[PDB]
Design an enzyme around this catalytic site. Structure first.
Site, PDB file in Angstrom:
ATOM      1  N   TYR A 288       4.659  -4.514  79.468  1.00 49.26           N
ATOM      2  CA  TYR A 288       5.270  -3.709  78.421  1.00 49.26           C
ATOM      3  C   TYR A 288       5.763  -2.371  78.979  1.00 49.26           C
ATOM      4  CZ  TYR A 288       5.769  -1.248  73.975  1.00 49.26           C
ATOM      5  OH  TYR A 288       6.262  -0.538  72.903  1.00 49.26           O
TER       6      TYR A 288
ATOM      7  N   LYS B  19       1.784  -6.382  66.438  1.00 48.85           N
ATOM      8  CA  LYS B  19       2.545  -7.617  66.568  1.00 48.85           C
ATOM      9  C   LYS B  19       1.903  -8.738  65.738  1.00 48.85           C
ATOM     10  CE  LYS B  19       4.333  -4.618  69.329  1.00 48.85           C
ATOM     11  NZ  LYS B  19       4.467  -4.810  70.811  1.00 48.85           N
TER      12      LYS B  19
ATOM     13  N   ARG C 208     -13.672   9.097  62.449  1.00 50.57           N
ATOM     14  CA  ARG C 208     -13.209   9.028  63.839  1.00 50.57           C
ATOM     15  C   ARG C 208     -14.201   8.251  64.710  1.00 50.57           C
ATOM     16  NH1 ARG C 208     -14.212  12.978  67.400  1.00 50.57           N
ATOM     17  NH2 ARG C 208     -13.914  14.599  65.796  1.00 50.57           N
TER      18      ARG C 208
ATOM     19  N   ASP D  29      -3.835  -7.842  78.538  1.00 50.28           N
ATOM     20  CA  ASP D  29      -3.137  -7.562  77.285  1.00 50.28           C
ATOM     21  C   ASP D  29      -2.728  -8.890  76.657  1.00 50.28           C
ATOM     22  OD1 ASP D  29      -1.282  -7.033  75.267  1.00 50.28           O
ATOM     23  OD2 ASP D  29      -0.489  -5.260  76.296  1.00 50.28           O
TER      24      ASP D  29
HETATM   25  C1  LIG Z   1     -18.849  14.277  65.284  1.00 49.19           C
HETATM   26  C2  LIG Z   1     -18.578  14.640  63.821  1.00 49.19           C
HETATM   27  S1  LIG Z   1     -17.815  16.304  63.677  1.00 49.19           S
HETATM   28  C3  LIG Z   1     -17.424  16.316  61.894  1.00 49.19           C
HETATM   29  C4  LIG Z   1     -16.388  17.373  61.442  1.00 49.19           C
HETATM   30  N1  LIG Z   1     -15.177  17.121  62.220  1.00 49.19           N
HETATM   31  C5  LIG Z   1     -16.814  18.852  61.545  1.00 49.19           C
HETATM   32  O1  LIG Z   1     -15.933  19.708  61.302  1.00 49.19           O
HETATM   33  O2  LIG Z   1     -18.000  19.116  61.842  1.00 49.19           O
HETATM   34  C1  LIG Z   2       9.592   1.836  72.447  1.00 54.60           C
HETATM   35  C2  LIG Z   2       9.629   0.726  71.391  1.00 54.60           C
HETATM   36  S1  LIG Z   2       8.809  -0.800  71.999  1.00 54.60           S
HETATM   37  C3  LIG Z   2       8.823  -1.793  70.467  1.00 54.60           C
HETATM   38  C4  LIG Z   2       7.846  -2.993  70.438  1.00 54.60           C
HETATM   39  N1  LIG Z   2       6.512  -2.443  70.667  1.00 54.60           N
HETATM   40  C5  LIG Z   2       8.140  -4.154  71.411  1.00 54.60           C
HETATM   41  O1  LIG Z   2       7.281  -5.063  71.477  1.00 54.60           O
HETATM   42  O2  LIG Z   2       9.211  -4.138  72.057  1.00 54.60           O
END
Ligand SMILES: CCSC[C@H](N)C(=O)O
Ligand SMILES: CCSC[C@H](N)C(=O)O
Ligand SMILES: CCSC[C@H](N)C(=O)O
Ligand SMILES: CCSC[C@H](N)C(=O)O
Lengths: 396, 396, 396, 396
Positions: free
Chosen positions: B112, B209, B59, B184
Site C-alpha cells: 500500500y 475495506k 482511549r 497486512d
Molecule cells: C489515562 C486516563 S487520563 C483521563 C483524562 N484524560 C484526564 O484528563 O485525566
Molecule cells: C490516499 C488514498 S488510498 C485509498 C484507499 N485506501 C485504497 O485502498 O486505495
C-alpha cells in the site's frame, strides 16, 4: 461576510459552518463516508495534485471534519486546524511531524500524564531527547535549550495544582533560541485562553474535555500556520500516526462546541463559588484555583486568562485515608478521571490512579496523599457544595 | 458455549458479542462515552492496577470496541485484537511499538502506497531502517535480513497486479532469523485468508475495506498474541499514535462485518465472472486476478486463499489515453480510490493518482499507463460487465 | 439519592440518568437496537404480563429513550414521560388516545399551524369535533364547553404575536367542567414554564425546539400521570400513531437538554436586548415580546413564566415588500421556519409560508404583511442587532 | 442512466442513491437536521407552494430519507415511497389517510398482532369498521365487501403458520368492488415478493425486519402511487400520526438494505435446510414453511414468491411444557420476538407472549401450545440445526 469578523460567541456558533449548499440543511451533514467519487479522471488527478479543491478520502480530509478544523482555527486565531483521534494523537502527530532522530525538546514537567509517558519513554527510543523543567520558571526553560532544540512544550494551567506558565514570556525565549512553542490549551479552551495571540506557534487540545464538553467524544485538534498544518496532515497524520477523527466524532464536537461560551461561563462561575467555599472550610488545608487571590501566579492568570477555569484541586485534612473516605462519601459528584464534562467529576489520585506509586515519588510529582481534583460541572453550585460539605465532614 | 467452537459464519455473526447484560439489548450498545465512573476509590484503584476487569477511559478501552476486537481475534484465530483510527494507524501502532532507533525492517516493495511512504521516509527519520525486497521471492527476504531485523512486513495479495507472497514460507524464514512476520490481510479479510494460521505473528487490517464493507468507516485492527497486543494498546496506542477508534466507528464495523461471509462470497463470485470476461476481451492485454489459472502464483493462491478475492487489475490496449477514455466512459462503476465497498469502484492510477509521477518510475512500480484497478461490488455482474464492455469499446 | 430532590440545573444534568450498571459508562449508552433477548421463556412471559421490569422491543420501550422520558417527567414535575417521533406525534398520540368518535375538544385558535390542521381537518373526519376559541379570554373557553368535551387544548406563549394563556385559570375552568387541560409547552421549555404545576393535566413538547436545542432532531415528548402515559404508550403509540422515537434521537435530545438551563438563560438575555432595540427603532411599528412591559398580558407573563423567552415577533414599516426586503437583507440571521436552535432564525410568513394565502385571511390569523418572526440564538446580541439594523435600514 | 433499468441486485445497491453533489461523498450523507435554510424569501415561498423542488423541514422531508424512499419505490416497482417511525406507523398512516368515519375495511384475520389491535379496537372508535376474514379464502373477502369498503388489507405469508394469500386474485376482487388492496410485505421483502406487480395498490413494510436486517432500527415504509403517497406525506404523516423517520434511522436502513439480496438468499438457503431437518425429526409434529411441498398452498407460493423466506414455524411433541423446555434449552438461537435479523431468533408464543391468554383462544388464533416460531439468521445452518436438535432432544 467573513467568519473572523464577528464577536466570539457568534464565531463559536457560526465559524467554519454554513447551510449545506445542495439542500440548505442547517446542521452540518455527517459525511460518514470513507471515499469520495470523482466525476472524471481529470478531476481525480487535479485533486491529487493539490491543484483543485475537493475531497479524496476521509483519512486525508472530510467535509464534516473540515468544518470543525476551520471553526477551531478561527477561535484560536490560527490559520488552519487538523482534527485527530485523540488529544494524545494531536500532541504526537504534532511532535512526530516536527522532530526527528537527534532533535531535542524542552518540556514542562507539570504536564498530562500520558504526554509525560510519550516524552519520557517513547521519544528517546526514536532518538529524540527531552529535557523536563519547571516551566513556571522561564529561566529553567532558557537554561535547558540546546542547538538541537526544535520545540518547547508547555501546558497551562497545569495539573495537579493548577500552576501557570507565562506563555508570552516563554514564547519570546523559545523564538530567540530558534525553537517553536507548542501549548496544550485543553484546560482553558479558546474561550478562556489564546496562546497563539501570546506568541505560541502551535496549539493542541484534547477536545475530549471542554471543547466537546459532553463526555462522549475522544478527540484532539491541532491549530497553527497553514504550512505546518499541511505537514501535520499530509505526513504526520497520513503516514505516521494515522490518527484521523471519525466524521461522526467531528459532528458531535461541532455540536458540543456550539455551547462552549455559555458552558465555560457557567463552569467558571460554579468553580469560583466552590473554590471560595473550600477555601473557607477548616478541614481543607489548601485550595488550588487560579481565581483565588492567594494563587502564587494570580496576576499572571488575570492577564493571560479571561476566566479562571472550571477545575479545582484541594487538599483534605488527614492525608490518604481522609481523601479516600471523602471521595467514597460523595453522592452527586462522580468518581472518574476525565474533565470538562457537564457533570461534576472528582478524583483522588493517591488512592485511585497512583495507589501503587511510591508516596515519596507522588510527592515529588506534586501529588500529596490528601489531594483531590475536581472538575466542576453545570449542576447548581449549591448542590455540589452541599455534596462536598457532606463528604468532607464525613471524611474528617 | 465458547465463541471459538462454532462454524465460521456463526462466528462472524456472534463472536465477541452477546445481549447486553443489563437490558438484554441484542445490538451491541453504542458506548459513545469518554469516561467511566467508579463505584469507589478502591474500584478505581483496582482497575488502574490491571488487577480488576472493567473500563476506565475510551482511549484505553471501550465495551463496544472491545466487542469488535474480540470478534476479529476469533476470526483470525489470534489471541487478542486492538482497534485503531485507521488501517495506517494499525500498521504504525504495530511497527512503532515493536521497533526503536537502530532496529531494522525487511518489507515487501509491493505494498500500500501510504505504508510505503511511512517506511521509506518516516521510519528512517526515527533511526529505524527499512530494506525493500520483492517478497514474491522469499530468498530476497532472507538475503535482506540483518542482526537488527525485528520485523518482516508483507501484503498479499499485493497491489497493483495482485501478486502473492507465500506466508508460511516467509514466516519460517523470518522466525529462523529471529524476526516477527507482520501481514497486512486487508485485501482478503479473515474469511479468505488466515495469516496467523500460516505462521504470521501479527495481522493488520484496514477495516475501511472489506471488514466494514460499507464505505463509511475509516478504521484499522491489529490481531496477535495477548502480550504483544497489550503493549500495542498500553504503549503504542496510549502514548505514541493515540490512534484509537471511535465507539460509533466500532459499532458500524461490527454491523458491517455481520455480512462479511455473504459479502465476500458475492464479491468473489462476481469478480471471477468479470475477470473471465476481461480475459476474453481482445482489447484487454492483461488481466491480473488470482482466480485465473494463468496467474503466475495460481497454485500458491489456491492453497493459501479460500477465495480469489474481489479485486481485479487489468491493462487496456492503447496505454494512458485509452485508460483515461475508459474510466471516463463508465456509467455504473464509480471513480474512486478505496476498495471493498458494496459499490463497484474503478481507478486508473496513471491518469488519476500518479499523473505527475514520471512514466518510467510508475513502470518500475508495476503501474503501466493502461493499468486499471477494479474493486468489484455487489451489483449484478451482468450490469458491471455491460458497463465495462461499453466503456472499453468506446475507449479503444 | 432521589432525582427529584436536587436543584433544577442539577436535575437538568442528572435526572433520569446514571452511569451504565454493567460498565460504568458515564454517557447514557445508545441502545440502538430493535429487539431484546430473554434469558428464558419465563422471563419473556413475566415481561409481557407487565409483571416484571425490563425491555421487550424498542417501539414499546428502550433504555435510552426511557432516560429521556424520566428526565423530562422530572423537569415538568410530572409522573411519567413518553417520547415520540415528532412534536406533532406527541400531540396526536395524546389526543387520539384521549378522544373517540362523538367526543369534543375546545382548542385555542392561536396554535401551531400543523396542530391547527390536525384539529380542523383530520379530527372531524374521525367524528371528533373541535371548537376554536380565543384562549386569551378564558370565558370563551368556558362558553365553548359541551357535555362531550374531553379536552381543552392550549399553547402559551402562542404564535404569531406571542399572546399568553392563563394556565391556572383555564385549568380551573376545564376541571370544573370535567375535562383535561393539555398544554403545549414547546416555546418555554420546563426551564421557563411548568404547566403541570399550574393545574394542567398533560404537557406536550416538540423537543425539536429548545429541549434538544441543536436543530438536528425532530421529536416530541408527552408528560403526565402514569396511568394516562401508560395508555398513551401501550395504545396510542403502540397501536395508533406508531410514532416512536429512535434511540439515537433520544440520545441526542438527552445530550442537547444537558445545556437547557444555560441555553435558555442566554436565549432570553439576548432576546430581551434585541426586543428593546426593536422597540426603540422608528422603522418598527410593533414588537411582540413578553419581556416588554407594553405586552398586553405582561403581568400574567411575570407570574407564569420565569423568563420571557427567546422568541420575538415584530412588524416592519412598509408591509409585505418591506418584510421581504428585510429578510432578504440579513447576513447573519438565517432564513428558516423552526425555532429554538443555537443559530438565530428569521422568517417572514407573509412572503415565505403564507404567500398564496389571501391577505385578509392572514390578517384574521394575526399575520400582518409586515410581521417578522425571530428565533434568537446564542450569538453575540450586538452582532444580531447590527445585522437587523442593517437589514431594516435597507428595507425601509 | 435511470435507476429502474438495472438488474435487481444493482438496484438494491444503487437505486435512490448517488455521490453527494457538493463533495462527491459516496455514502449518502446523514442529514441529521431539523430545518433547512432558504437563500431568500422567494426561495422559501416557492418551496412551500410545491412550486420548486427542495427541502423545508425534516418532518416533511429530508435528503437522507428521500434516498431510502426512492430506493424502496424502485425495488417494489412503485411510483413513490414514504418512510415512517415504525412498521405500525406505515400501516396506520396509510389507513388513517385513506379512511374516515363511516368507512369500512376488510382485513385478513391472520395478521401481525399490533395491526390486529389497531383494527379491532382503535379503528372502530373513530367510526371506521373492520371485518376480519380468512384471506386464504378469497370468497370470504368478496362476501365481506360493503358499499363502504375502502380497503382490503392482507399479509402474506402470514403468522403464525405461514399461510398464504393470493395477491393477484384478491386484488382483482378488491378492484371490481371499488376498493384498494393494501399488502404488508414485511415477511418477504421486495427481493422475494412484489405485491404491486400482482395488482396491489399499496405496499407497507416494517423495515425493522429484513429490509434493514440488522436488528437496530425500528422503522416502516409505504410504497404506492405518487398521488396517494403525497396525501400520506402531507396529511397522514404531517398532521395525523407525525410518524416521521429519523435521518439516522433512514441512513442505517439504506446501509442495511445494501445487502438485502445476499442476505435473503442466505436466510432462505438456511431456512430450507432447517425446515427439511425439522420435517425429518420424529419429535416435531408439524413444520410450517412455504418451501416444503406439503405446504397447503405450495404451488401458489412458487408462483408468487421468488424464495420461500427465512421464517419457519413448527410444533414440538408434548405441547406447552415441551415448547417451554425447548426454548429454554437452545444455546445459540436467541429468545426474542422480532425477526429478519442476522442472528437466529426463536420464540414460543404459548409460554412467552400469550401465556395469560386462554388456551382455547390461542388455538382459535392458530397458536397451539407446542408452536415455536423461528427466524433463521446467517449463522452456519449446521450450527443452528445442532442447537435445535440438542434442544428438542432435551425437551422431549
Ligand atoms: C489515562 C486516563 S487520563 C483521563 C483524562 N484524560 C484526564 O484528563 O485525566
Ligand atoms: C490516499 C488514498 S488510498 C485509498 C484507499 N485506501 C485504497 O485502498 O486505495
Ligand atoms: C411546516 C414547518 S413548521 C416548522 C417549525 N416546526 C416551526 O416552529 O415553525
Ligand atoms: C410487540 C412486539 S412484536 C415484535 C416483532 N415486531 C415481531 O415481528 O414479532
Amino acid at each position: 461576510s467573513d467568519c473572523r469578523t464577528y464577536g466570539f460567541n457568534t464565531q463559536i456558533v457560526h465559524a467554519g459552518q454554513q447551510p449545506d449548499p445542495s439542500t440548505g440543511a442547517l446542521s452540518t451533514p455527517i459525511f460518514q463516508t470513507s471515499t469520495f467519487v470523482f466525476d472524471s479522471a481529470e478531476q481525480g488527478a487535479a485533486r491529487f495534485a493539490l491543484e483543485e479543491s475537493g475531497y479524496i478520502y476521509t483519512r486525508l480530509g472530510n467535509p464534516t471534519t473540515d468544518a470543525l478544523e476551520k471553526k477551531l482555527a478561527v477561535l484560536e486565531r490560527g490559520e488552519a486546524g487538523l482534527a485527530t483521534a485523540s488529544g494524545i494523537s494531536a500532541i504526537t502527530t504534532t511532535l512526530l511531524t516536527l522532530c526527528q532522530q537527534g532533535d531535542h525538546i524542552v518540556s514542562a514537567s507539570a504536564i498530562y500524564g500520558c504526554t509525560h509517558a510519550f516524552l519520557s519513554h517513547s521519544m528517546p527510543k526514536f532518538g529524540i531527547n527531552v529535557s523536563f523543567v519547571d516551566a513556571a520558571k522561564p529561566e529553567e526553560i532558557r537554561a535547558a535549550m540546546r542547538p538541537e532544540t526544535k520545540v518547547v512544550y508547555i501546558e497551562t494551567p497545569a495539573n495537579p495544582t493548577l500552576s501557570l506558565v507565562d506563555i508570552e514570556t516563554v514564547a519570546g525565549i523559545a523564538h530567540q533560541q530558534g525553537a517553536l512553542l507548542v501549548v496544550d490549551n485543553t484546560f482553558m479552551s479558546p474561550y478562556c485562553q489564546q496562546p497563539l495571540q501570546l506568541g505560541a506557534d502551535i496549539v493542541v487540545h484534547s477536545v475530549t474535555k471542554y471543547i466537546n464538553g459532553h463526555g462522549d467524544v475522544i478527540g484532539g485538534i491541532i491549530v497553527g500556520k497553514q504550512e505546518f498544518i499541511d505537514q501535520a496532515r499530509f505526513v504526520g497524520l497520513k503516514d505516521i500516526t494515522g490518527g484521523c477523527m471519525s466524521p461522526f466524532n467531528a459532528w458531535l464536537t461541532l455540536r458540543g462546541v456550539k455551547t462552549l461560551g455559555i458552558r465555560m461561563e457557567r463552569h467558571c462561575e460554579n468553580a469560583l463559588k466552590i473554590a471560595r467555599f473550600l477555601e473557607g472550610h477548616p478541614s481543607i488545608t489548601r485550595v488550588y484555583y487560579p481565581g483565588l487571590s492567594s494563587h502564587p501566579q494570580y496576576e499572571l492568570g488575570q492577564r493571560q486568562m479571561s476566566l479562571p477555569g472550571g477545575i479545582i484541586s484541594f487538599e483534605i485534612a488527614g492525608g490518604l485515608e481522609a481523601g479516600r473516605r471523602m471521595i467514597n462519601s460523595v453522592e452527586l459528584c462522580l468518581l472518574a478521571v476525565s474533565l470538562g464534562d457537564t457533570e461534576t467529576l472528582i478524583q483522588h489520585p493517591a488512592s485511585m490512579t497512583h495507589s501503587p506509586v511510591a508516596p515519596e515519588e507522588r510527592l515529588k510529582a506534586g501529588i500529596t496523599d490528601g489531594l483531590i481534583r475536581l472538575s466542576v460541572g453545570l449542576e447548581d453550585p449549591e448542590d455540589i457544595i452541599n455534596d462536598l460539605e457532606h463528604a468532607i465532614r464525613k471524611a474528617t
